[PDB]
Amino acid sequence: KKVVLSSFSIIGDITQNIAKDLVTVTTLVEAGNDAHSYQVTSADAIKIQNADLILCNGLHLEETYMKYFTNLKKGTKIITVTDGINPIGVSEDTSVDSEPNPHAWMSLTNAMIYIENIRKALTALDPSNAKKYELNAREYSEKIRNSILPLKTRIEKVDPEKRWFVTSEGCLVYLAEDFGFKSLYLWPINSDRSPSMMRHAINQMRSHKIKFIFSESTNSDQPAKQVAYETNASYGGVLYVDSLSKPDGPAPTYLDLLRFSLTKIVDTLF
Q1: At a CB cut-off of 8 Å and minimum separation 6, what does 187 contact?
Q2: Is 169 annotated as contributing to ligand binding?
Q3: Mind telling me which residue stretches traverse the membrane in this protein (predicted)?
């Protein structure tokens, strides 16, 4: 039985829906840890040795621990499951070039690309099961579309002047792009804050009469609430974007994570 190591919980869950036990799916950065600032342990080095295939997000998400994906089993490839997603830069000033924002999985379109890239890699690893990964990938893709599309459809009725997703981390930039909304946030990447970015958000919210700002499940709510106060906006609550929740939390699977967060967004913007 082949072993497929996913860099973090979200990619692990996607991969499990496509493979459905045809392979053993393991996860490096388990739910509840920051994927960008993780420390790889001795035990983790065993997971890495056992891997027949390694699935990374790319977009620099794993940049601090790429070096641990070395001395690998012969034939073990590292696949970037975001291949074909045009990166969005960590610059809010989209003039300058900048490091990529890693959060490509917060997108209906991109969910389909993650699935496709993983299907492809599983199929090149284990070609005698091609027909099963094929079926599984289609089913799973459908499942995602069936849950998430009705949320898109609701979101798209928003009045254009209210088309803003305002968060703490820049976790929704790919969602904004996919659904045709503008983005505003306080810092691009949690692991990394700027007083000027906060000032800029405040000014932008006042200027565009933006009504809500969110925080997320792995960062503090304090800055969002302060910005709400200073802008006469409302604090929107906590979104799940950077990790699956624990099993009894609201986002134990990638589908549940998209559904939860998009539901919360929709429910606050109407």
Answers
A1: 168, 169, 170, 193, 194, 197
A2: yes
A3: none
Q: How was this structure determined?
A: X-ray
The amino acid occupying position 21 is D
Letter for the amino acid at 171? C
* Residue 20 burial (C-beta neighbours within 10 Å; 0-12, 13-18, 19+): middle
Tokens representing 246? Answer: 């624990």
Residue found under tokens 């379109």: 109
Tally of CB atoms within 10 A around 181: 21
What is the stated resolution of the deposited model, in angstroms? 1.9
> Which distant-in-sequence residues (6+ apart) come within 8 Å of 4 by Cβ?
15, 19, 23, 24, 25, 26, 51, 52, 53, 54, 55, 122, 125
**Closest among 193, 175, 192 to 266, alpha carbons compared:** 175
Residue 45 CA to chain centroid, in angstroms?
A: 24
CA nearest neighbour of 14 among 170, 189, 244: 244
CB 120 within 8 A of CB 187: no
Cβ(14)–Cβ(27) below 8 Å: no
For the chain, give every domain's residue range: 2-156, 157-269
- SS3 category, 28: strand
Length of the chain: 270
Structure tokens at 163: 């088309």
- Whether 242 has a binding-site annotation, put simply, is yes
> Which residue bears the tokens 């600032």?
37
DSSP element (H, E) containing 36: none
End-to-end CA distance of the chain: 49
Q: CB-based contacts of 165: which residues, under 8 Å, 6+ apart? A: 172, 175, 176, 181, 182, 183, 184, 265
Half-sphere exposure at residue 225, Cβ-oriented, CA atoms within 13 angstroms: 6
